[PDB]
């Protein structure tokens, strides 16, 4: 329920979904009680949180940040833009980050509320808690 | 109360608007099931119609029956334009927001789901008044005791 | 020819036109309901009010002829006109139901459009959605449904039924606020009504609904295209409404509509479903799909090495371009060429030796009409909408009775006088073909009448023009197949099934070395084929037809279409020099197996689920007027 | 805000006799000039007629015309408060450069070349603005599809990792637009600035700074910046092209996602523009609800700029307080609009809903406290003077740069220019409400910080006036102009009568019946003048909707300020210009 197993994610703020990310980190919601350290350097991070829409111009740059992370890693696509392309079916928008980087949790919303982002993280933890529990 | 959360389909429970009751004679519906008459106003008003999938048929008795209603929330703006376009009081936005999941498939609502969401939303906050926030204790941490008035 | 003013804007208008006509031509939108360019003026809806400055009075523009220097004002500059538009639209909405969510007219409704643009914008006369009633009677029909509360009683249907189609099947049931439209005879499906759908199309609202289209879609979710209807030789231009398979609608034809010229019959209005029925859209060998290139090689071998033992049976439902390419290939293969119309039509035209084929527009010049043969209204229906002069008759008369035809004898034709149009149907002369043709040939030379042959199949007259002198007799070709003189048959369509029953082709599949069937359907004659080749239907090709409305060229827009013409032209690239032909003739008399009917005139309308219901109800009825 | 005065029009006609043609629209006044005389007219309008302030420039695509591209220019006379619009056709796909007249127009020319393909002879290394070097299309062209050209199969890797090969959603398109490579990004970087110094500092495309998506390029000599450029496009999604495919009312939610920090402000600018084109009056109750909520967003937006500005220099204690106050504003907006950030509160004709019960009591509880908390941030910041000296002398913007670069919002006011559209070109209710326009004297980073601070105070005074006005209105007063045909009525009306239902169906199926014509209107958004230039050929969908970003022009002056300075001042400079990746379309 409450695990000392810490998670070190890198928040990739690209659009509006990033503003809601800051509100979750602030004094109103306490995302620390869940063991989220939030390191800023991608070299020492294991969870890639894509918060915002990914433009085709940013796709090669984002993929590089992913391959540059240690192998025990997960990825959370916050909002529909990073999940499936969101409300932008246009010539310059990448329809979902899972097309260039596997994602483990999709958080719907435009943008999701701070609690929705928290529930989404618990879901990632739920997965990991029983990912090392089967085999 | 005005939160624009996961969509829902209000059900046939007796509290339908005059517009729907006026066309009930043309519909093939079941008590406690979706009110939708497949008018396509929600999807037509929506700037992202591709996320919807609505299908209706004409039964051999002449009545109309809705056979499919799916929504893909990952391409939704949560803008509320569709609810504005519903002329029968069927489409609605609930308070449901804990929908993060592991696959694009879990973010696709079928009709059966839209009904369950609305039924639950009406069951828990149907008679709740339209207030700026519904609970003052959860807000007291940040605001404190507010001097309300009539 | 005349200068007028609409909101102080000078506009030139041809004398004889109305203010409403002129305004619409110039893009000045004036709301209107009862005016229809094809019907007589009614002046009943009053929605077209304009302020006539010259007389300081509100006047209806649909009835106002243009006069030199007249000055009118529309809602653009007149509050009086604006107030009456709001009142008139509010009046119509008083008992109009809140049916838009399920009404088939939503999106293309005159009341919904005008009511939202010029209406009251709010409810002024407070009527509950639950009290939106008007007197009503069941039309007792499986195809049409009347919603009297949606009716904005405008009398377009009554006028169209009486002035255009002429069936006189509707009447206005009791006067006043509750005036409601009722069929003169119920059940409607077997009454004088010809189920042409014109009432559905002229209705400005969803009062008259097409049951086959009800609730299946929404008007704004369909694609639209216009082309030539090939279900008979008239050549009407109709609009096909279809879906593609995306979020809006299924990949099929949903309904069809006439243009504002109201040229359409039941076959054209309810037969759209024949386009969706068991289509053959890919080349196949046996039951296995095969690439067109491989089929082209098979045919190239058949005609190159065995053309002199190959017979080609044309279809009159083929456009000129395909007929010509196939005929050119035949002449390069030394094959036999025929068409089922060689049984009756070609024998008649050979004796008549010269005929007339004027356009429908030229029908105005006739003083009288003589119908010889079948029921013209059942063969080329829309023609019955233009034969408004005196009508004489020799032959079968069922739906033609609406024209009050006078029966006569061939001996009486000698005494008619002045620009007589003789419309003769060769498929209904049974053994008197040569005799009748000989008689009409005398009449055309001595008295100068116009002898117009009315084929029952769309491009049969062009087939005759391109096959005269070289066609083989259909029975002779079949007889040659039994003898073994013809080893391969390329049959186009199912025109042949009007003379031979299915079993014959079940046996021919065994006897022939190659039985090639070119059809649009996976069922029927194509089931017995060795090689199946798709044949295009209306809206799937750019082919021209020699019809009563002229030489009309269709449009290709249905996305699942098989490129019929491209296939044949590709095959033709393998045939350059003309080699010749073989002709077989025979005196055996083949009798037609079935008489055409208003709701079933060919193998295409036969595959329409809608028309089949109408046909089953009316097949035995022979008297509709007396 | 009037357009060209009769006097300057004649002096322009007497000088360009058969080369210009004066014209008027329901909402714009301007000129049509021959190609070879475009620049002489502009230089005349700016130098000899005082239209020094550059507003915007773009192009319209008319494939049915031989020239096919009409250049559109909009200038402003601050001395007389007038606007002018100048149009001209492109000769063989070219146009004259105007960057020597208005340096700020350089980026507008870059945007046009990337969206339409128009080259500006003499642009000084014209490169695409948003797309990468080598893109093969011009998306704003009418024959280019909105979804681009799908060419590559790009399955969902998460679905492939689980064997599920079937499409995961009924709207999942496997074919995708071609994706660039890291090498493709390198060419746009090198093709941007021509080597001038020792090292090529590269702060992007993605960097851990405050405005992480903004890409910068510095030419350094040790620690000094000689040359400098910016590369945007890290958030370009085709807004202007999405509008061409939507009805007017359908674009409101897309305006929230431009400057996501102040959504209600974006909606007000857009809606106020469309309401001019359609000629829609807004009832009083809605005008005060718009004005009040637009000001609550300005406070909310400045708090973010202040919180993120404080976060840039440590002192995270200010970030927590700033966001503590933002959470209060969001509790009011979310309770009334229904969403925390992308409100989608305004509607064409008024507001979505009336105020939620008890909403005025919460605002009063906020207006009483917020004044005291503003005094905390003033002294909690100036407490540490280690940074106070780091701003009182750098980044000075002269009034010449305000007009030459087209600056607006706090950036222009901090330099002395009292350019505030809430007063110069009133909208919603800023005429019936009394407030003051803060203006600086030095024009440095500090003056812009102080300008934004009093704007929050001035906004509290505006909200206070909107509260007393709303209390005096019966809750019976309308918040929607239901009598206009282009205004979609609330569902409650449609559930009740047919007279309302037919309006909903008409607008939703066909769109509003917009008349032909053109309109240019702008709103005083927290970061500057948010302009909307709409061109209508008639119908439910606009032919072209050009969005003039006030923040975009505020960033165009960045290379001028950091030049000849130290790179350490880049963090404080960028923060004092308050840019947003979202307003770069
Ligand atoms: S999901 Fe919505 S809020 Fe998040 S970046 Fe995309 S459009 Fe903006
Ligand atoms: S608008 Fe309402 S009734 Fe119409 S299709 Fe959507 S949910 Fe169903
Ligand atoms: S909330 Fe907006 S984007 Fe989502 S389905 Fe409804 S109208 Fe479409
Ligand atoms: S007739 Fe027109 S206004 Fe009446 S319900 Fe049907 S679509 Fe609506
Ligand atoms: S559909 Fe045609 S024939 Fe039948 S009643 Fe109407 S107008 Fe007459
Ligand atoms: S049924 Fe249609 S066409 Fe006939 S009167 Fe009524 S509204 Fe007019
Ligand atoms: S008359 Fe002939 S051409 Fe005209 S619609 Fe009927 S079948 Fe088609
Ligand atoms: S249109 Fe003139 S009265 Fe009906």
Curated annotation (Swiss-Prot), chain A:
Question: What sections of the sequence does the record tag as coiled-coil?
Answer: none
What does it catalyze? a quinone + NADH + 5 H(+)(in) = a quinol + NAD(+) + 4 H(+)(out)
Its GO biological process terms? aerobic respiration; electron transport coupled proton transport
Query: Which principal EC class is assigned to this enzyme?
Result: translocase
Compartments (UniProt record): Cell inner membrane
Enumerate the UniProt keywords alphabetically: 4Fe-4S, Cell inner membrane, Cell membrane, Iron, Iron-sulfur, Membrane, Metal-binding, NAD, Quinone, Translocase, Transport, Ubiquinone
List GO molecular-function terms, semicolon-separated: 4 iron, 4 sulfur cluster binding; iron ion binding; NADH dehydrogenase (ubiquinone) activity; NADH:ubiquinone reductase (non-electrogenic) activity; quinone binding
Q: Which family does it belong to?
A: Belongs to the complex I 20 kDa subunit family.
Entry function: NDH-1 shuttles electrons from NADH, via FMN and iron-sulfur (Fe-S) centers, to quinones in the respiratory chain. Couples the redox reaction to proton translocation (for every two electrons transferred, four hydrogen ions are translocated across the cytoplasmic membrane), and thus conserves the redox energy in a proton gradient.
On subunit structure and binding partners, the annotation says: NDH-1 is composed of 14 different subunits. Subunits NuoB, C, D, E, F, and G constitute the peripheral sector of the complex.
Q: What is this protein called?
A: NADH-quinone oxidoreductase subunit B
Which species is this UniProt entry from?
Aquifex aeolicus (strain VF5)
Taxonomy of origin reads: Bacteria, Pseudomonadati, Aquificota, Aquificia, Aquificales
Whichever gene encodes this chain, its name is nuoB
Q: Which residues of the full protein are shown?
A: 20 to 154 of 179
UniProtKB/Swiss-Prot annotation, chain B:
Which positions bind [4Fe-4S] cluster 1?
36, 39, 42, 86
Query: EC number(s) of the enzyme?
Result: 7.1.1.-
Q: Does the keyword DNA repair apply?
A: no
Keywords, in A-Z order:
4Fe-4S, Cell inner membrane, Cell membrane, Iron, Iron-sulfur, Membrane, Metal-binding, NAD, Quinone, Repeat, Translocase, Ubiquinone
Residues at which [4Fe-4S] cluster 2 binds: 46, 76, 79, 82
GO CC aspect terms: plasma membrane
Main localization of the protein? membrane
Cofactor, free-text remark = Binds 2 [4Fe-4S] clusters per subunit.
Give the cofactors, semicolon-separated.
[4Fe-4S] cluster
The entry's function note states: NDH-1 shuttles electrons from NADH, via FMN and iron-sulfur (Fe-S) centers, to quinones in the respiratory chain. The immediate electron acceptor for the enzyme in this species is believed to be ubiquinone. Couples the redox reaction to proton translocation (for every two electrons transferred, four hydrogen ions are translocated across the cytoplasmic membrane), and thus conserves the redox energy in a proton gradient.
Describe its assembly.
NDH-1 is composed of 14 different subunits. Subunits NuoA, H, J, K, L, M, N constitute the membrane sector of the complex.
Q: Which family does it belong to?
A: Belongs to the complex I 23 kDa subunit family.
Name of the protein in question: NADH-quinone oxidoreductase subunit I
Record organism: Aquifex aeolicus (strain VF5)
Curated annotation (Swiss-Prot), chain D:
Q: Does the keyword RNA-binding apply?
A: no
| A Pfam family the protein falls into | Complex1_30kDa
UniProt-listed NCBIfam families: NuoD (TIGR01962), PRK06075.1 (NF004739)
Q: What does this protein do?
A: NDH-1 shuttles electrons from NADH, via FMN and iron-sulfur (Fe-S) centers, to quinones in the respiratory chain. The immediate electron acceptor for the enzyme in this species is believed to be ubiquinone. Couples the redox reaction to proton translocation (for every two electrons transferred, four hydrogen ions are translocated across the cytoplasmic membrane), and thus conserves the redox energy in a proton gradient.
Q: Where is this region: NADH dehydrogenase I subunit C?
A: 1-173
In the record, the note on similarity to other proteins reads: In the N-terminal section; belongs to the complex I 30 kDa subunit family.
Q: Which GO terms describe its cellular component?
A: NADH dehydrogenase complex; plasma membrane
Q: Report the membrane topology from the UniProt record.
A: Peripheral membrane protein
Tell me the InterPro entries matching this sequence: NADH_Q_OxRdtase_suD, NADH_quin_OxRdtase_su_C/D-like, NADH_UbQ_OxRdtase_30kDa_su, NDH-1_subunit_CD, NDH1_su_D/H, NiFe-Hase_large
Enzymatic reactions: a quinone + NADH + 5 H(+)(in) = a quinol + NAD(+) + 4 H(+)(out)
List the EC numbers from the record.
Answer: 7.1.1.-
Q: What is the scientific name of the source organism? A: Aquifex aeolicus (strain VF5)
Keywords, ordered alphabetically: Cell inner membrane, Cell membrane, Membrane, Multifunctional enzyme, NAD, Quinone, Translocase, Transport, Ubiquinone
Annotated protein name in UniProt: NADH-quinone oxidoreductase subunit C/D 2
Assembly and oligomerization: NDH-1 is composed of 13 different subunits. Subunits NuoB, CD, E, F, and G constitute the peripheral sector of the complex.
